[PDB]
Amino acid sequence: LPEPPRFVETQTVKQIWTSMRFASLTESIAVVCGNPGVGKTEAAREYRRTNNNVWMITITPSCASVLECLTELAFELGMNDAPRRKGPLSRALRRRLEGTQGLVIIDEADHLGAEVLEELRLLQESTRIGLVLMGNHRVYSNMTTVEFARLFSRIAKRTAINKTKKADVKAIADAWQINGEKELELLQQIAQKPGALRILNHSLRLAAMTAHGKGERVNEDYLRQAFRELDLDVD
Amino acid sequence: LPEPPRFVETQTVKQIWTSMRFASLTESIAVVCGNPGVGKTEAAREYRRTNNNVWMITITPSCASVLECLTELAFELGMNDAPRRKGPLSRALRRRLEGTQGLVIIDEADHLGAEVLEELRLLQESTRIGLVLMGNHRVYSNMTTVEFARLFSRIAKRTAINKTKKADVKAIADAWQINGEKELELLQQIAQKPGALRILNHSLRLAAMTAHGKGERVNEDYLRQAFRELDLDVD
Ligand SMILES: Nc1ncnc2c1ncn2[C@@H]1O[C@H](COP(=O)(O)OP(=O)(O)O)[C@@H](O)[C@H]1O
Ligand SMILES: Nc1ncnc2c1ncn2[C@@H]1O[C@H](COP(=O)(O)OP(=O)(O)O)[C@@H](O)[C@H]1O
């Protein structure tokens, strides 16, 4: 019956915003390597939503080249007049973004070739801007160890988040107006299982839509009815 | 009138034989980087002349590839039936030289590409043998720094010889039967100028052929007559 919150600031969100603003204002490269289902994509989306001079793209294996990634960057910077070449595209990206004190955000940096990430680091080094990587722990694990070693000298900042926190899901429950202590422990048990923010928000929206359709309050019984579903331990 | 010595053991020769036998019996890679005119080529030739299970090739820019270098190696190992391919040539070189406890000697390793020296180090690592490099100081200076870094872990031994020694030219003068103290100082002055063994042996053979043609002994005057030639300080 109250509003379902689309987002809440957490301890992990306040950490990743600190590292984000650090990589931007420092104008240096930071890696966010950690297991997904923790919210780094939506946190970076929230940062780009709240703050200007911030740019965030995604990288697919269908867009794993240098040219496709720079085309994504040209679409993100607001330039539909991107040349199909690699050279003058790169120099136009260098022209547009110089002096902006901007921030480039890279999601799924584990799908990168060495030439692609090398062109991105030489780009940001020739632009005096900040670069932020996302993905699993393989993003850092592809570097330990000699081809990204100068990049390992440029990579100074990383905040690695494997699993969530107690105050993390506590602030989430505060956003969703949850005060049951057994409910708190059950949400922590949800946070124990992987895909934590995903499975958590699934269970929360199931319980919320159930409590609105039945006209009631989300209780621990609606949490068991939601979390008992989704077939997580089914092989 | 006595015999002109083709070779003498020196302190530098005893050092480079120690490093040579070390790289061979250790079955690991050693670098000899230093300015030429010091005798490393003739010392390695002397080592191969005195000792069995020892192989020494040269590398030209006309033979700077992997295939040409392995063809040189196949000629050096006594196999005229070398295939023109790169694969079965390399495996035949691996077959012939395994269990031999041999020594490969490389002259002018400064002309090497990374693929060539990488194939040589993977060869010797797949053969359990010793590899010895020669050349100027650029041989080590091409590594400081990430592509030969694992090779920098395999390169443990190096003896760098820039200039000669006092006992060096003293033993040379003892081979050439020289007992003048001013003659000793003048030979040291020859050793000060670069191309030391080359210019030294040039001056020695000029003085020796002069003393045989005039029927006399090599004196300090024949040393001035030889060393005053060769036009070293002429631009
Ligand atoms: N503050 C928040 N409150 C609730 N859910 C969040 C919050 N931030 C992120 N999420 C959740 O994170 C999920 C996506 O992030 P995630 O899959 O962890 O990204 P990545 O796959 O890059 O690690 C979304 O389903 C979203 O519900
Ligand atoms: N023991 C020795 N006595 C006299 N001369 C020597 C001796 N060893 C080497 N040399 C001289 O070294 C010269 C060639 O070696 P060098 O040019 O220094 O090889 P590199 O060019 O590989 O450094 C020859 O001219 C030879 O006269």
Curated annotation (Swiss-Prot), chains A, B:
Its main location: host cell. GO terms for molecular function: ATP binding; ATP hydrolysis activity; DNA binding; metal ion binding. The keyword Magnesium applies. Its EC number is 3.6.1.-. GO terms for cellular component: host cell cytoplasm. It catalyses: ATP + H2O = ADP + phosphate + H(+). Residues 153-235 bind DNA. Changing R154A: 60 fold decrease in ATPase activity due to impaired ATP-binding. No polymerization. The record marks R85, K86 as: Involved in DNA binding. ATP binds at G34, N35, P36, G37, V38, G39, K40, T41. One of its GO terms (biological process) is DNA transposition. The record marks R154 as: R-finger. The record marks R198 as: Sensor-2. The N-terminus region contains a putative DNA-binding region that allows filament-filament interactions and probably favors MuB polymerization and filament clustering. The central region contains the ATPase module. The C-terminus comprises four helices arranged in a loosely packed bundle which can bind to dsDNA. Selects the target DNA sites for transposition. Recruits DDE-recombinase A to the target sites and catalytically activates it. Displays non-specific DNA-binding properties. Polymerizes as helical filaments around the DNA. Coating of the DNA by the target DNA activator B might play a role in favoring target-primed replication over integration. Prevents self-integration into an integrated copy of the viral genome. This is ATP-dependent target DNA activator B. It comes from Escherichia phage Mu. The gene is B. The chain holds residues 67 to 305 of 312 of the full protein.
